[PDB]
Design a protein around this nucleic acid. Structure first.
Ligand code: MG
Ligand code: MG
Length: 76
RNA sequence: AUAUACCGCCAUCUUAACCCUGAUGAAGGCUACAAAGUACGUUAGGUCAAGGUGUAGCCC
């Protein structure tokens, strides 16, 4: 949601451009166009910090996994 | 004599594209503590005094 409590225009724009979307959807949000909605609290700093930590860890681990798989493939 | 011959000079008057919204209607698109917007003619004009080119008049 944007600062007038309406959906972020980027949701509809990404749907138009066929870009998958992951999203934290609170009880007052619209999850219809988010490809992978995640119901949860988006206001408390603890929840937002947890979301950031989880996503950062997942992305970093995925990139490291790709690099080590490529290294193993090159070695073998 | 003629600018009521022309110039020279003064003066008069006329006169692109793109992207979104509306159910893809005419149509619309902004908020910064940001909410779709970005890329010349005219005149029986004057002036031959600090300028010129012609044209006609008269020649017991
Ligand atoms: Mg909320
Ligand atoms: Mg005159």
């Amino acid at each position: 949601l944007n600062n007038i409590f309406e959906p972020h225009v980027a949701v509809r724009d990404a749907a138009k451009m066929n870009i998958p979307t992951v999203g934290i959807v609170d009880t007052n949000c619209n999850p219809c166009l988010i490809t992978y909605p995640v119901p949860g609290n988006d206001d408390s700093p603890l929840a937002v910090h947890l979301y950031c930590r989880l996503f950062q860890t997942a992305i970093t681990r995925a990139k490291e996994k790709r690099q080590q798989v490529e290294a193993l493939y090159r070695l073998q």
